[PDB]
Design an enzyme around this catalytic site. Structure first.
Site, PDB file in Angstrom:
ATOM      1  N   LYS A  92       0.856  -1.182   0.000  1.00 41.00           N
ATOM      2  CA  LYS A  92       0.000   0.000   0.000  1.00 41.00           C
ATOM      3  C   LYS A  92       0.889   1.227   0.000  1.00 41.00           C
ATOM      4  O   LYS A  92       2.030   1.178   0.457  1.00 41.00           O
ATOM      5  CB  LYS A  92      -0.934   0.039   1.206  1.00 41.00           C
ATOM      6  N   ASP A 114      -7.297   3.678  -5.378  1.00 38.71           N
ATOM      7  CA  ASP A 114      -8.053   3.543  -4.143  1.00 38.71           C
ATOM      8  C   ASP A 114      -8.720   4.866  -3.810  1.00 38.71           C
ATOM      9  O   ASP A 114      -9.004   5.644  -4.723  1.00 38.71           O
ATOM     10  CB  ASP A 114      -7.175   3.063  -2.999  1.00 38.71           C
TER      11      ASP A 114
END
Length: 419
Positions: free
Chosen positions: A105, A145
């Site tokens: 991430k 995202d």
């Protein structure tokens, strides 16, 4: 005393779900710290002739199974702990549907609603020139995202191709690209088509016929919409109750999932839809339906409203709506819950088929993706269900045992952990 950290709470799930499996003590200390954290400073040039320096992160959890994969968040409340929790959450999401991937991430501490369309182009490129040394097609693959979109993942691909000098498959460095630059077909319906295949296989496992049954969907975003829409088409169920952030509606004779959107697309809510009966957000969970699906927010099913649920399948589409106090209350009632990294795992599976296509160069069709998405989720659900039948545990706890043991067996074969 009172500290609510995301990373130390994302380890406490692993230490809880290590007791159900025989795992060595040297692998438990390896899975608790990410293997490479790159924290860079990202400078852009503003419109008034000035320079601002934002902070950028990139956490790679574990590349034991393959190249690590994960989204990119743009949010002003980003920390290093909030990325390291979603980094160690990703390696149990690319393992339970059995992908050759690892977790990762990244984030930028920025507020994107106060940057114009030109400053978002410079911020997306100057991120890539800062972390070029740790990404790549076979090394680490970004994705969109929260507060990103497929428009930005086109710009990040252009800056990576300029640095690489086109000596490699540069269309596969980042997934979630637009269609005309090397994306995949059937990506906007991926997070709900994952939920339908695991709902369909759940009632087959539970022995429930579905033609004529009733499904209530909480939240009406872009993911909870197609879950309502595909249920009336592919499954055959009658949608009887939806809701958005304001309030909900109800009709036991059917709520046509196409027209509830256009009513919401006009005003901004689903209040007073014609031919229904308006209720609140809270009363939707205590209905009497065949299958309930929390797709709205986190912590909606807790100790107060646990026992009042009258349903048969609670498929957790959104990221962890049910709290573990309520999992004891619901499971003794005989309720088949689907875990949150098993019901919305359509997001990673179709964004894996956007990496397989770009590496080879041959682009598949729309029906070739949906017929291959059905093959993974059916097999991945029947590894989680059959493990639940053996050790006599909950489906959330049994989905962690399959997810850890694939990463632990991949670390043992590579020679990383000896015992």
């Amino acid at each position: 005393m009172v500290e609510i950290d995301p990373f130390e709470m994302a380890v406490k799930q692993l230490e809880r779900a290590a007791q159900y499996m025989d795992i060595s003590e040297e692998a438990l200390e390896w899975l608790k710290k990410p293997m490479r954290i790159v924290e860079v400073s990202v400078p852009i040039e503003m419109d008034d002739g000035s320079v601002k320096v934002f902070t950028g992160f990139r956490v790679q959890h574990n590349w034991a199974r393959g190249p690590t994969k994960g989204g990119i968040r743009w949010h002003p409340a980003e920390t290093l702990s909030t990325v390291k929790a979603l980094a160690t959450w990703m390696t149990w999401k690319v393992a339970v549907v059995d992908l050759p991937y690892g977790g990762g991430k990244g984030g930028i501490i920025v507020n994107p609603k106060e940057l114009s369309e030109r400053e978002q182009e410079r911020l997306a490129r100057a991120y890539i020139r800062a972390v070029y040394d740790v990404i790549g097609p076979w090394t680490d693959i970004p994705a969109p995202d929260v507060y990103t979109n497929p428009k930005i993942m086109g710009w990040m691909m252009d800056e990576y191709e300029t640095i690489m000098r086109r000596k490699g498959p540069a269309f596969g460095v980042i997934t979630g690209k637009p269609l005309s630059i090397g994306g995949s077909l059937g990506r906007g319906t991926a997070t709900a088509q994952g939920a339908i295949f695991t709902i369909r296989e759940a009632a087959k496992a539970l022995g429930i016929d579905l033609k004529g049954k009733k499904i209530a969907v909480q939240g009406y975003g872009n993911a909870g919409y197609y879950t309502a829409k595909l249920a009336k088409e592919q499954l055959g169920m009658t949608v009887v109750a939806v809701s958005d952030s304001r309030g909900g509606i109800y009709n036991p004779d059917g709520l046509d999932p196409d027209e509830v959107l256009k009513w919401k697309r006009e005003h901004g809510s689903v209040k007073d839809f014609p031919g229904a009966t308006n209720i609140t957000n809270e009363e939707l969970l205590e209905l009497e339906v065949d299958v309930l699906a929390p797709a709205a927010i986190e912590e909606v099913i807790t100790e107060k409203n646990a026992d009042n649920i009258k349903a048969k399948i609670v498929a957790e589409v959104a990221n962890g709506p049910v709290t573990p106090e309520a999992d004891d209350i619901l499971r003794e009632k005989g309720i088949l819950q689907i875990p949150d990294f098993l019901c919305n795992a359509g997001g990673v599976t179709v964004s894996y088929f956007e990496w397989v296509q770009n590496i080879n160069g041959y682009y598949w069709t729309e029906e070739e993706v949906r017929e291959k998405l059905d093959k993974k989720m059916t097999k991945a659900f029947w590894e989680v269900y059959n493990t639940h039948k053996d050790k006599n545990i909950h489906m959330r706890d049994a989905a962690y045992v399959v997810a850890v043991s694939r990463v632990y067996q991949a670390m043992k074969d590579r020679g990383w952990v000896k015992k």
